[PDB]
């Protein structure tokens, strides 16, 4: 199983430490394809190739980010299963387009609190 | 001719006044098409019908990115507008999608958004 991870970078790196813990936990459920200056053309093409190869896409969507949204858009259009993880304690209301994309199966959006991310991942993969 | 406009809402409404100026100007060039489950389905229907997709990408937003992702996969022509004087660096995925043709990303200053739209649509 191959896993593609999405998380804000230029959108803001507030959750960078959490992302590292998510990527470490994903390694027990599959090969993490992502490597979250060749330039942005190179980054885009490399990532699209990885997204095509992915069996599942996991995104932490608490921090707003164009690139995370874009990856999820390309992923849906490729027919990839998607898990989005969101923390309501951020005080933000999650994107209408991401929340509304949820269908409870091919596209899941799960609210979670600090301390629960590993448990959420276990639940999804097991 | 139909146009779909994308701009941050829950990502932040900092540029909402600018979005209204964009939408006003787009009406010269075509019909501007533009709870959550309903919003998503309605918007995907509009996106599928749109001849061109226009996005102001200065404020980071998951929904705007999502719209652009779905639009690329649908084969729509896309214009993204970005303000470098905002002081942030535009998303690697949006900047990297640029090809100078069916996915264009234009840097502009806040006062010249109308001129940027004029240039694109007079060409298109
Ligand atoms: N340097 C990079 N190397 C690999 N991916 C990058 C890189 N920069 C950005 N990304 C991709 O873009 C997404 C973040 O979008 P952004 O708009 O915040 S730059 C990430 O999920 C990641 O997938
Ligand atoms: N209330 C709404 N009605 C129609 N579209 C909405 C609505 N709220 C958000 N959107 C769509 O989501 C995009 C913004 O994404 P966001 O993640 O900031 S909520 C907009 O370009 C818009 O297209």
UniProtKB/Swiss-Prot annotation, chain A:
- Does the keyword Lyase feature in the UniProt annotation? no
Superkingdom is: Eukaryota
- Residues engaged in binding 5-hydroxymethyl-dUMP: 7, 9-11, 65, 67, 71, 95
**Induction of the gene:** Up-regulated in response to c-Myc and by partial hepatectomy.
- Describe the pH profile of activity: Optimum pH is 6.0 with dGMP or dCMP as substrate.
Sample GO molecular function, one term: protein homodimerization activity
Q: What is the effect of changing residue 4 to A?
A: 100-fold decrease binding affinity for GMP as substrate
Effect the entry attributes to changing residue 71 to A: 100-fold increase in Km and 170-fold decrease in catalytic efficiency for dGMP as substrate
Where is this protein localized, as stated in its record? Answer: Cytoplasm; Nucleus
Q: What is its EC number?
A: 3.2.2.-
**Major localization class:** cytoplasm
Q: In which tissues is it expressed?
A: Highly expressed in heart, kidney, liver and spleen. Weakly expressed in lung and skeletal muscle.
Gene Ontology BP terms: allantoin metabolic process; deoxyribonucleoside monophosphate catabolic process; dGMP catabolic process; epithelial cell differentiation; nucleoside salvage; positive regulation of cell growth
| GO cellular-component term (any) | nucleus
Using the record's annotations, give every residue carrying the modification Phosphoserine. Answer: 8, 65, 90, 95, 105
The UniProt catalytic activity note for this protein reads: 5-hydroxymethyl-dUMP + H2O = 5-hydroxymethyluracil + 2-deoxy-D-ribose 5-phosphate
What keywords does the record list, in alphabetical order? Acetylation, Cytoplasm, Glycosidase, Hydrolase, Nucleotide metabolism, Nucleus, Phosphoprotein
Q: Does the keyword Cytoplasm apply?
A: yes
**What role is this protein assigned?**
Part of a nucleotide salvage pathway that eliminates epigenetically modified 5-hydroxymethyl-dCMP (hmdCMP) in a two-step process entailing deamination to cytotoxic 5-hydroxymethyl-dUMP (hmdUMP), followed by its hydrolysis into 5-hydroxymethyluracil (hmU) and 2-deoxy-D-ribose 5-phosphate (deoxyribosephosphate). Catalyzes the second step in that pathway, the hydrolysis of the N-glycosidic bond in hmdUMP, degrading this cytotoxic nucleotide to avoid its genomic integration.
Q: Which family does it belong to?
A: Belongs to the 2'-deoxynucleoside 5'-phosphate N-hydrolase 1 family.
Describe its partners and assembly state.
Monomer and homodimer.
Q: What is this protein called?
A: 5-hydroxymethyl-dUMP N-hydrolase
Species per Swiss-Prot/TrEMBL record: Rattus norvegicus
> Which lineage do the record's taxonomy fields give for this organism?
Eukaryota, Metazoa, Chordata, Craniata, Vertebrata
Q: Which gene encodes it?
A: Dnph1
Full-sequence range covered: 11 to 148 of 163
């Amino acid at each position: 199983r191959s896993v593609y991870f999405c998380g804000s970078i230029r959108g803001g790196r507030e959750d960078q430490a959490l992302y590292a813990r998510i990527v470490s936990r994903l390694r027990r459920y599959g090969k993490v394809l992502t490597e979250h200056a060749g330039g942005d053309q190179f980054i885009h093409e490399q990532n699209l190739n990885w997204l095509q190869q992915a069996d599942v896409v996991v995104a932490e969507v608490t921090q707003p980010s164009l690139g995370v949204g874009y990856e999820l858009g390309r992923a849906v259009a490729l027919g990839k299963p998607i898990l989005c993880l969101f923390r309501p304690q951020s005080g933000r209301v999650l994107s209408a387009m991401i929340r509304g994309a949820a269908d409870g199966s091919r596209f899941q959006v799960w609210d979670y609190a600090e301390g629960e991310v590993e448990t959420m991942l276990d639940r999804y993969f097991e």
